[PDB]
Coordinates of C-alpha atoms and ligand atoms in Angstrom, one line a residue:
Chain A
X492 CA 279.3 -151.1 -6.0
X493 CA 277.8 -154.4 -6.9
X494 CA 279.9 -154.7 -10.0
X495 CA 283.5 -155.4 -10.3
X496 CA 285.5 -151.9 -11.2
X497 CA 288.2 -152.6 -13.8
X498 CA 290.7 -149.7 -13.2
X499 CA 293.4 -149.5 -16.3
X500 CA 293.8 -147.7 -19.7
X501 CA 291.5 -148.1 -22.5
X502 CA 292.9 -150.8 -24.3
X503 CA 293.1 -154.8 -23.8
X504 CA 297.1 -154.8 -22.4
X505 CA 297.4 -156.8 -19.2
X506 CA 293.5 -156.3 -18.1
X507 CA 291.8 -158.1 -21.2
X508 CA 292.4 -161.8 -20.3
X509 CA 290.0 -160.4 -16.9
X510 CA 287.9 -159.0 -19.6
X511 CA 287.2 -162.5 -21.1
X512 CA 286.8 -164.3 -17.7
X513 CA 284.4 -162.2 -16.2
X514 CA 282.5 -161.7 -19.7
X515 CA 282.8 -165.5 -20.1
X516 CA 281.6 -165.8 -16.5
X517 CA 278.2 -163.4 -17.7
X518 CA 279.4 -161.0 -14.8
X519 CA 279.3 -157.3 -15.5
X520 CA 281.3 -155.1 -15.1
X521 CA 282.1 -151.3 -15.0
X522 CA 285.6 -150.1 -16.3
X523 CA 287.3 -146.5 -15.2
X524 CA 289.6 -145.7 -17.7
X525 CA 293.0 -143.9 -17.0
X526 CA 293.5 -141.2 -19.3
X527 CA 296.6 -139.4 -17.9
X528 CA 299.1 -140.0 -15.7
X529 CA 297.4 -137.8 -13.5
X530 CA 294.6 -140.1 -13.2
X531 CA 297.2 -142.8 -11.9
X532 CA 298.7 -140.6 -9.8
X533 CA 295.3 -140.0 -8.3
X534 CA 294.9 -143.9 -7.3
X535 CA 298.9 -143.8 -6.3
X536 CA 298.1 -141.5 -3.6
X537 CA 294.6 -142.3 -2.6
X538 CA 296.3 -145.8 -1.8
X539 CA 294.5 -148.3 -4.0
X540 CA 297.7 -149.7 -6.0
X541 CA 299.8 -152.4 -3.6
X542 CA 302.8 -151.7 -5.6
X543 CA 301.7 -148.4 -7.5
X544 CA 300.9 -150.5 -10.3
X545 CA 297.4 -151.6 -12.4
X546 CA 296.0 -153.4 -13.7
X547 CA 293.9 -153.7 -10.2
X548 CA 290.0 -154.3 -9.7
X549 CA 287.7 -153.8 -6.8
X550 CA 286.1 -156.6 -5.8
X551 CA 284.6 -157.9 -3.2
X552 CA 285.5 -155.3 -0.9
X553 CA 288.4 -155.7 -2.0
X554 CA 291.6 -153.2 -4.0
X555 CA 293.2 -156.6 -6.0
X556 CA 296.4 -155.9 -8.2
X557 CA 298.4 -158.1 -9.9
X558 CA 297.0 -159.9 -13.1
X559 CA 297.4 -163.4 -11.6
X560 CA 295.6 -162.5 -8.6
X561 CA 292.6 -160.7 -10.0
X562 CA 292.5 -164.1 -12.5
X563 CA 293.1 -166.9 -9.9
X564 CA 289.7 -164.9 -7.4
X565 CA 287.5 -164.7 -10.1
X566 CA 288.3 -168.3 -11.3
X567 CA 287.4 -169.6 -8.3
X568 CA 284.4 -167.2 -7.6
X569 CA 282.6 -168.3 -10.4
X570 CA 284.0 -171.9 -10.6
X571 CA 286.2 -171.9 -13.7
X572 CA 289.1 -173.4 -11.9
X573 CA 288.6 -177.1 -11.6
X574 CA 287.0 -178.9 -9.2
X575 CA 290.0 -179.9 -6.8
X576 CA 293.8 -179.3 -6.5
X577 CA 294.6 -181.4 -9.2
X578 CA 292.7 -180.2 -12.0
X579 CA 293.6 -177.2 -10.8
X580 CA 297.6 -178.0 -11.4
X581 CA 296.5 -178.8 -14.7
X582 CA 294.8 -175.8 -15.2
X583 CA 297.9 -173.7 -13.8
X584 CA 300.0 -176.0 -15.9
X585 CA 298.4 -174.8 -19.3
X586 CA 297.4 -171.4 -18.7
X587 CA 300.9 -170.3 -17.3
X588 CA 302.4 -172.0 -20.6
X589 CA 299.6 -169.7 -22.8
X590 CA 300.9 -166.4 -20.6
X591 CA 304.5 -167.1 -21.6
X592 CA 303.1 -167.2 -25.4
X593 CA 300.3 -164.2 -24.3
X594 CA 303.4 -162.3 -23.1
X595 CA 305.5 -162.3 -25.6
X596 CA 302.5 -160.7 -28.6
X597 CA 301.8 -158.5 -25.8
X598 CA 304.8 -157.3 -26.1
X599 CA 306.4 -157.7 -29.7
X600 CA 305.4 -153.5 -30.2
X601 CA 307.9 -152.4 -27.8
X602 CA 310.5 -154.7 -29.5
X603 CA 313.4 -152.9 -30.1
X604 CA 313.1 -152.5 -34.3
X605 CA 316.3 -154.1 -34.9
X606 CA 314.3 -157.3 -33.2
X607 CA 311.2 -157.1 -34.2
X608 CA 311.6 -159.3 -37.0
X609 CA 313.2 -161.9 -35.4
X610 CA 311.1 -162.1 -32.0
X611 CA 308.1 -162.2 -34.8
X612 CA 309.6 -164.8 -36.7
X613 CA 310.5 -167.0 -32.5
X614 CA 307.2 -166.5 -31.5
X615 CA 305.3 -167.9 -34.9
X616 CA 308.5 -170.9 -34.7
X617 CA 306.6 -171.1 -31.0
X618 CA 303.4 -171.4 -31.9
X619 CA 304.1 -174.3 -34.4
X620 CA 306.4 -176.3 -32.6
X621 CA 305.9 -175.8 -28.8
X622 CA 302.2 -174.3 -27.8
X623 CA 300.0 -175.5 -30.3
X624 CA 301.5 -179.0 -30.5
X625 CA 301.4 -178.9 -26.8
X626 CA 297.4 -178.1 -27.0
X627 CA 296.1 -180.0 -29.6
X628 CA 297.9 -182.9 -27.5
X629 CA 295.9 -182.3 -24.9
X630 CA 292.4 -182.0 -26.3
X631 CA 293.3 -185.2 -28.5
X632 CA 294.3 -187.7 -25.7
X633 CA 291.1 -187.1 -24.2
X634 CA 288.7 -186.1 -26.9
X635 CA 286.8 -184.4 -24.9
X636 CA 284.9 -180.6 -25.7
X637 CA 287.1 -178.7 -22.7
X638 CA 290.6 -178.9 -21.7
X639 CA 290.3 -179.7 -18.2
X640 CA 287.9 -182.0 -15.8
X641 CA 285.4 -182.3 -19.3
X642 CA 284.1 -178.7 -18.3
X643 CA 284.6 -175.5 -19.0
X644 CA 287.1 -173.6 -17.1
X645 CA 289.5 -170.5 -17.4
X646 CA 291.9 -173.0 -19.4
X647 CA 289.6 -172.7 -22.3
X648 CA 288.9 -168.9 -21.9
X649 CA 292.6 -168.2 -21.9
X650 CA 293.5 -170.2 -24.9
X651 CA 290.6 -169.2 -26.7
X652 CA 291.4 -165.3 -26.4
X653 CA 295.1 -166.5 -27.6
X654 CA 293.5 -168.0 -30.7
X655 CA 291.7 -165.0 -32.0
X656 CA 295.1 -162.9 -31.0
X657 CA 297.4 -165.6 -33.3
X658 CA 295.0 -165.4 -35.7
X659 CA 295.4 -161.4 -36.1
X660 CA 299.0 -162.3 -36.4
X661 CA 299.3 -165.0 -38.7
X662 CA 295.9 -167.0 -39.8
X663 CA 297.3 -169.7 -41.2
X664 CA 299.2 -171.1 -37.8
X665 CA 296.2 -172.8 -36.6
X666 CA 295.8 -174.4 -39.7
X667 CA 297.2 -177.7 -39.0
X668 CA 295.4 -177.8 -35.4
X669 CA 291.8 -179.1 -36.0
X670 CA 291.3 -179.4 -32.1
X671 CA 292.4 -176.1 -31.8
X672 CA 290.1 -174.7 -34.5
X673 CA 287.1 -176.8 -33.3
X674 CA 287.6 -175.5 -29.8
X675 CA 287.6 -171.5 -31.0
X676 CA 284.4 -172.6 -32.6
X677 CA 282.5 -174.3 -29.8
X678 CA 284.0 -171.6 -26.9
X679 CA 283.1 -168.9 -29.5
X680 CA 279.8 -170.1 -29.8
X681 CA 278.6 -170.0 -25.9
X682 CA 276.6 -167.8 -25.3
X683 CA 278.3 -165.4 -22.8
X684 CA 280.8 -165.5 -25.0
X685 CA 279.6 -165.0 -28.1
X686 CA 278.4 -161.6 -26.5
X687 CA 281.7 -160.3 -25.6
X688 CA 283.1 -161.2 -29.3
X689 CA 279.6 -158.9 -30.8
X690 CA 280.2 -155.7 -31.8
X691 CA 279.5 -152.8 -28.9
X692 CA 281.1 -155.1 -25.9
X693 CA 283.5 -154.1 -23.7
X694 CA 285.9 -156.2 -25.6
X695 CA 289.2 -154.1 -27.0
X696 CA 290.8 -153.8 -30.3
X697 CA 294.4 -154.3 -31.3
X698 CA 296.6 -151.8 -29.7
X699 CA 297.2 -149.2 -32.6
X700 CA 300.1 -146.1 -32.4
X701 CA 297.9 -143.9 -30.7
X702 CA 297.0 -146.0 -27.7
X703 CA 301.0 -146.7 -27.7
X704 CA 301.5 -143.6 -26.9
X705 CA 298.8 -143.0 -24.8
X706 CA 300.6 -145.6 -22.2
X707 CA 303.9 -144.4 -22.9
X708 CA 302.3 -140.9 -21.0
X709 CA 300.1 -142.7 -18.5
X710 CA 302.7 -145.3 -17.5
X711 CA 306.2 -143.1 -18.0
X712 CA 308.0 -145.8 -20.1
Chain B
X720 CA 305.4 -193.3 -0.7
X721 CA 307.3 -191.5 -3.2
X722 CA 309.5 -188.4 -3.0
X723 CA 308.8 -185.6 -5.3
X724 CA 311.9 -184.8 -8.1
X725 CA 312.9 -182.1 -8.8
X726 CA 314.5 -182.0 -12.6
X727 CA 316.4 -178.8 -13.4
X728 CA 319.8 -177.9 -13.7
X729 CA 322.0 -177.7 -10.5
X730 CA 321.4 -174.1 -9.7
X731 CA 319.2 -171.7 -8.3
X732 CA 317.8 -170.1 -11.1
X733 CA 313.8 -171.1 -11.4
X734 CA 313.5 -173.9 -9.2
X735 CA 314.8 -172.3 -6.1
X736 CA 311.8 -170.8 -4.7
X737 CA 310.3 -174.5 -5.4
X738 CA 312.8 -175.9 -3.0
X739 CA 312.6 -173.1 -0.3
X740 CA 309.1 -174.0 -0.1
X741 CA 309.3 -177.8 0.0
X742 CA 311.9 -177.5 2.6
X743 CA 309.5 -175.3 4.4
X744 CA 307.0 -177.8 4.8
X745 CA 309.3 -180.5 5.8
X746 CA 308.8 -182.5 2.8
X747 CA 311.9 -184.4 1.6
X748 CA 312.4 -184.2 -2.3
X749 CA 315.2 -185.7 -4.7
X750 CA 316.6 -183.8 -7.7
X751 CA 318.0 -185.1 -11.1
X752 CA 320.3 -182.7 -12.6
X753 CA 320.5 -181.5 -16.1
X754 CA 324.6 -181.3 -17.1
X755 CA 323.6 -181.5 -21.1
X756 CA 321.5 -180.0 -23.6
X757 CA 321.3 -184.6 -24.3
X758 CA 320.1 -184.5 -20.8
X759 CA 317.6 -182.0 -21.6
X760 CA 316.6 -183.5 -25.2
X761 CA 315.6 -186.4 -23.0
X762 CA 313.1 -185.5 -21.3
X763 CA 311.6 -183.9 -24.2
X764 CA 311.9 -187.1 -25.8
X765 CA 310.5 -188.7 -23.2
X766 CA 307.4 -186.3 -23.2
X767 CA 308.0 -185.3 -19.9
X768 CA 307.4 -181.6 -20.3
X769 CA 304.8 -180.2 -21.8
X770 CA 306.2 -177.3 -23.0
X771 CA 309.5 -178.8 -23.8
X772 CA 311.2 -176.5 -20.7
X773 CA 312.0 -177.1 -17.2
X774 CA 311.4 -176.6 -14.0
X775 CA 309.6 -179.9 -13.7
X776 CA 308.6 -181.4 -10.6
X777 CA 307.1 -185.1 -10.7
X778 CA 304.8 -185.2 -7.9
X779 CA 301.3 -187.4 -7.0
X780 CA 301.3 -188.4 -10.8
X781 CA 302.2 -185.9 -12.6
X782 CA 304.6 -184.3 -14.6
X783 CA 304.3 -180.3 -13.3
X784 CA 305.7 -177.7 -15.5
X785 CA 305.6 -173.8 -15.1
X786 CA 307.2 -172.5 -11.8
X787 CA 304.1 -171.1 -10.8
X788 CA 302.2 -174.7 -11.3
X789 CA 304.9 -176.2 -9.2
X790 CA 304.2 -173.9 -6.4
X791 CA 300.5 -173.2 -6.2
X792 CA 300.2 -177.0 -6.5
X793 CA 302.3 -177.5 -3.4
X794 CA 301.3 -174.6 -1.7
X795 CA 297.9 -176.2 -1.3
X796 CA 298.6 -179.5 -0.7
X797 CA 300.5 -178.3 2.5
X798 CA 298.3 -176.0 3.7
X799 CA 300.5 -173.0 2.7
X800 CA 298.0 -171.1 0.6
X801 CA 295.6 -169.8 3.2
X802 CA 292.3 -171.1 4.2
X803 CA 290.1 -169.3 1.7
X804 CA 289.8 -167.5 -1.3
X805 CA 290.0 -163.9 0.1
X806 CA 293.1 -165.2 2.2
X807 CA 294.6 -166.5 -1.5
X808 CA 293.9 -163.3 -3.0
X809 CA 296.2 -161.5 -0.5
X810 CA 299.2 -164.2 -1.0
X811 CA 298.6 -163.8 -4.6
X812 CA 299.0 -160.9 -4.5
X813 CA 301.8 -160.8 -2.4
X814 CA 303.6 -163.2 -4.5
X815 CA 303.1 -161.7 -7.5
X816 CA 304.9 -158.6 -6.7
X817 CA 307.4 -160.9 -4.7
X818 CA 307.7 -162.7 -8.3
X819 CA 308.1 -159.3 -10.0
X820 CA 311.1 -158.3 -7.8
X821 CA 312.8 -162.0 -7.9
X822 CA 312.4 -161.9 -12.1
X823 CA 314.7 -158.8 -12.1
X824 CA 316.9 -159.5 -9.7
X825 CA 317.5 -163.3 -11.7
X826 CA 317.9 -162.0 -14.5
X827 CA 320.2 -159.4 -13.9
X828 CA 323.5 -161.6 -14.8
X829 CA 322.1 -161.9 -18.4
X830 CA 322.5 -158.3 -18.9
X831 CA 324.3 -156.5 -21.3
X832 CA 327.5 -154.8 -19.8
X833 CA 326.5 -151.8 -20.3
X834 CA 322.9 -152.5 -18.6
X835 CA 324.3 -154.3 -15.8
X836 CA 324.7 -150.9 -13.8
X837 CA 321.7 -149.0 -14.6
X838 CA 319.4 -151.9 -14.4
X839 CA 321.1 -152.7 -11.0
X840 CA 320.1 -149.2 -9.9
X841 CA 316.8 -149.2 -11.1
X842 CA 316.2 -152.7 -8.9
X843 CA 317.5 -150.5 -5.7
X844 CA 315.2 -148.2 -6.1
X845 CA 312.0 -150.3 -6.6
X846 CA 313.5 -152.0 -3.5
X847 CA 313.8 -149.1 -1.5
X848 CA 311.1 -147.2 -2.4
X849 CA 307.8 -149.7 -3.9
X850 CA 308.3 -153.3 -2.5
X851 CA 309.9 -153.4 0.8
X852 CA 307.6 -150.1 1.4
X853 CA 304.7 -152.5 0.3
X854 CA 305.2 -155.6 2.4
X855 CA 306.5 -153.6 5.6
X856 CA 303.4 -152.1 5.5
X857 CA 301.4 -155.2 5.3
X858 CA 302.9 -156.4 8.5
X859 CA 302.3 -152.8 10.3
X860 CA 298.9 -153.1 9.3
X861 CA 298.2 -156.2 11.4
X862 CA 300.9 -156.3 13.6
X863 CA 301.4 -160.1 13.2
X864 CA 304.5 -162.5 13.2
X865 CA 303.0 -164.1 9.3
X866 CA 301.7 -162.0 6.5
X867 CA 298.3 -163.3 5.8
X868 CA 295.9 -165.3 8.1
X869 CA 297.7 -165.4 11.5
X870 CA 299.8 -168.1 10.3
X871 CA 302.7 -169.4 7.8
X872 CA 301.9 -169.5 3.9
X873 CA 304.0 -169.3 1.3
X874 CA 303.6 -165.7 1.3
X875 CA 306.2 -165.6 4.1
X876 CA 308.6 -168.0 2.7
X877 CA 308.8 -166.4 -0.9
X878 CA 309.4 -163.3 1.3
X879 CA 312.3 -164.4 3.2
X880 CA 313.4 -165.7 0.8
X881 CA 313.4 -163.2 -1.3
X882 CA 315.2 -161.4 1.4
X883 CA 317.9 -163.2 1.3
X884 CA 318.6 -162.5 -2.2
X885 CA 318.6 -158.4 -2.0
X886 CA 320.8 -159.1 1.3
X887 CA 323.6 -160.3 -1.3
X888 CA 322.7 -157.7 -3.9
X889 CA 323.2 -154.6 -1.2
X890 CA 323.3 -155.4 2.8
X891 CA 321.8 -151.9 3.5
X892 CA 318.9 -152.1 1.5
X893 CA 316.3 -153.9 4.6
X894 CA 318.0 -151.3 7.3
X895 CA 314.8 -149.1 7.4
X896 CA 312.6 -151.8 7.5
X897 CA 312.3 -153.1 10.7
X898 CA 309.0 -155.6 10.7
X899 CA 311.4 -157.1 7.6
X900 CA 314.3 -157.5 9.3
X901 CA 311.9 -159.6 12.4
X902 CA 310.2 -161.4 9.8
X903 CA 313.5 -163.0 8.1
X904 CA 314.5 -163.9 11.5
X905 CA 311.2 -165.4 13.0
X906 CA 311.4 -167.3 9.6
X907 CA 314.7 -168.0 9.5
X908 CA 314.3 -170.0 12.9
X909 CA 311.4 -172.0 12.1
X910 CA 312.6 -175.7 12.2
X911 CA 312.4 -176.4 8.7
X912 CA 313.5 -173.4 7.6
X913 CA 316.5 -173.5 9.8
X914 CA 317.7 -176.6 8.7
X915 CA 317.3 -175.7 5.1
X916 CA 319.7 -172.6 5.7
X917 CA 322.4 -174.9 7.5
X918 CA 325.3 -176.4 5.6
X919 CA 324.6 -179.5 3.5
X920 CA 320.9 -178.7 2.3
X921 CA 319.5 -178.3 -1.2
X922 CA 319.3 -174.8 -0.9
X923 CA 321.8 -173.6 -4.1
X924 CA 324.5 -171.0 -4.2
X925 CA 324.0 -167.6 -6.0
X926 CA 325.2 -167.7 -9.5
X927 CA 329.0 -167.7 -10.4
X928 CA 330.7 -167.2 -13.8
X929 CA 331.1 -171.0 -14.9
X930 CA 326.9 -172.0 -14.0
X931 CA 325.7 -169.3 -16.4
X932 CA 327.9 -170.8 -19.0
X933 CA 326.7 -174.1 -18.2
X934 CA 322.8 -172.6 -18.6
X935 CA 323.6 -170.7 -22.0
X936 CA 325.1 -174.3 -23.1
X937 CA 322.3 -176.1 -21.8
X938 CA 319.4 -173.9 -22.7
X939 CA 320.7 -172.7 -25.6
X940 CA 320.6 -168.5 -25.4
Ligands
GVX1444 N1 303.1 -158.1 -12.7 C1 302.1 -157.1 -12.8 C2 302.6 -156.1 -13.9 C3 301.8 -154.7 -13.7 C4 302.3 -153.6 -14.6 O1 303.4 -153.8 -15.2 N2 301.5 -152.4 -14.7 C5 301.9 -151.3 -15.5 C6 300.8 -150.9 -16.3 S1 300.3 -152.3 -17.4 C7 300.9 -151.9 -19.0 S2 302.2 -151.0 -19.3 N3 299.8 -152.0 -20.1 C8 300.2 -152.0 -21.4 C9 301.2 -153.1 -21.7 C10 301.7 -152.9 -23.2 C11 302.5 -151.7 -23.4 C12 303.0 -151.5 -24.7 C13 302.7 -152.4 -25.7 C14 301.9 -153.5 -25.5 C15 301.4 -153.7 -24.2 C16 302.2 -150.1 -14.6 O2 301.5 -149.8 -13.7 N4 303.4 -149.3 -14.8 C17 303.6 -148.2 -13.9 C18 304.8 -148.5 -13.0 O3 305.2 -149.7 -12.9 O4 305.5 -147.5 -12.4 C19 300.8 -157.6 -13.2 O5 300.7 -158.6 -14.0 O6 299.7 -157.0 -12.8
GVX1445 N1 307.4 -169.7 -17.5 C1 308.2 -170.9 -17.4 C2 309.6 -170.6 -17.9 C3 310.5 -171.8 -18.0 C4 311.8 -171.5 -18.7 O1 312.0 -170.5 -19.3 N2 312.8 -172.6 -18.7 C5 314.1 -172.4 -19.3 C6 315.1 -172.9 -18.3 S1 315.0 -172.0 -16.8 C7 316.3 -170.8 -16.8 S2 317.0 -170.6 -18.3 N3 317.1 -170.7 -15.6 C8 318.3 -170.0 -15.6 C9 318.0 -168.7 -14.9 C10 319.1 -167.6 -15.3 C11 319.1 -167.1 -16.6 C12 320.0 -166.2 -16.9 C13 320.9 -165.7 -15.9 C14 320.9 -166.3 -14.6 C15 320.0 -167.2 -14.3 C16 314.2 -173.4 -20.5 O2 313.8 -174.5 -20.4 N4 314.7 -172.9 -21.8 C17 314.8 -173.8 -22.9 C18 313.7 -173.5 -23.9 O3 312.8 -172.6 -23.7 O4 313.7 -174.1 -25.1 C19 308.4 -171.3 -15.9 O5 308.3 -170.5 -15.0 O6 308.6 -172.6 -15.6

């Protein structure tokens, strides 16, 4: 049990920004995928799940749930969250503005379809006026290659993975964000993390109709 | 020195939990209350939030945004988020499913009439039968007066507070959950804590009819 066990479904959901991290961080991991709500059931009652819930990880010795927990451990195991308390606000500041965005894609397929149009059309309005701006701001007031402390740190990660999922939605957003693009590039391009964008990773594709479904059983919603 | 502001409407909505734990350390803070979308369009203008929203709490410098930037910022700097990283992985998680609870339970105004009822019930149940379950088994587990560490963190304040809040919602709901019932109280009669609970602090009211209008008009939703 050396390496951290990712227990969830298999598909990105609320487990693939961990994914990233500890890919990023060149840690390896092993992943049990849920198949049926039997198999959640199964951690339920063997008491892993704090609140009956996954994602959750074990690590360390530990049974970790909650997304932000499991994120926040490994950032500071593997020093990708700042160096002190302050670059760690900053950190915390950005990254908890990229969940809001992160939570609402995550989400636009269980959009009512009377909505789905116009939570598509909020979250794109978003992207131009309010994160993006907010981002390339950052990286152009101090010109430097990471958003935080000159050194990379789960900021990047995070906003990085958000990139490639705007870009699935709409390609041309980023357009007008020449920061932005030059930091997809350069984060893209590291090694650890060019890895986990190859072909045969552990990364996850796009949540497609069947996978829908497949939570819909697993997760009774 | 200076204070720390606290810039947010005058209500409990996001920023309460921010001014439960301030109190809680016995730091004094001043807020600056938003009456107008103008008030609002102002600090934006100003560039005082970098996601355009509030809460934001100026403090040592900065400019925080995102309630959970607020608090893990504070947390630390008084000594309220545990003493190592295995210790902040436990309030995390904590929190998190503290946070969980708390977003349904403030949201619940904003539903739909004919939501309001089942959504209500719904919230009852996860009370009854996943959270308090949850932490009143963390506290059997050790048998000691704080959750994590032998000693106060934030963990115990979001709690209590937190406690509060379903003691509104339906009195009966802690009766089975005795450790619960101690820990509000032992918290309740810290110093700090006491004081904020008396008359005449910044500790807000729960929501009436005329401060949701005055949200929807300010927030725009
Ligand atoms: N705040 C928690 C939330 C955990 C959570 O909601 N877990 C879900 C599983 S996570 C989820 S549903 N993954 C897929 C999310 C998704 C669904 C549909 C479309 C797109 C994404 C769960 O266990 N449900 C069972 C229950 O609560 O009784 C966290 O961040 O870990
Ligand atoms: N993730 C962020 C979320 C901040 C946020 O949503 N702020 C709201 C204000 S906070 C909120 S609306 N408090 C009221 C809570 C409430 C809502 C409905 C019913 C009862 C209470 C805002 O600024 N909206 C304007 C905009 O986005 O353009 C954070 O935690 O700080």
């Amino acid at each position: 049990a050396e390496k951290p066990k990712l227990h969830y479904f298999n598909a990105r959901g609320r487990m693939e920004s961990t994914r990233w991290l500890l890919a990023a961080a060149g840690v390896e991991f092993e992943e049990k995928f849920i198949k049926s709500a039997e198999d959640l059931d199964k951690l339920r009652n063997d008491g892993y799940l704090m609140f009956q819930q996954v994602p959750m990880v074990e690590i360390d010795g530990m049974k970790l749930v909650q997304t932000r927990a499991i994120l926040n451990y490994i950032a500071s195991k593997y020093n990708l969250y700042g160096k002190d308390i302050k670059e760690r606000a900053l950190i915390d500041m950005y990254i908890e503005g990229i969940a809001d965005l992160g939570e609402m894609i995550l989400l636009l397929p269980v959009c009512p379809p009377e909505e789905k149009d116009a939570k598509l059309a909020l979250i794109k309005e978003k992207i131009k006026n309010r994160y993006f701006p907010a981002f390339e701001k950052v990286l152009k007031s101090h010109g430097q290659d990471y958003l935080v402390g000159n050194k990379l740190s789960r900021a990047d990660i995070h906003l990085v993975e958000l990139l490639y999922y705007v870009e699935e939605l709409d390609s041309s957003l980023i357009s007008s964000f020449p920061l932005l693009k030059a930091l997809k590039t350069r984060i893209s391009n590291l090694p650890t993390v060019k890895k986990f964008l190859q072909p045969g990773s552990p990364r996850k594709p796009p949540m497609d109709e069947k996978s829908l479904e497949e939570a819909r059983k697993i997760f009774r919603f």
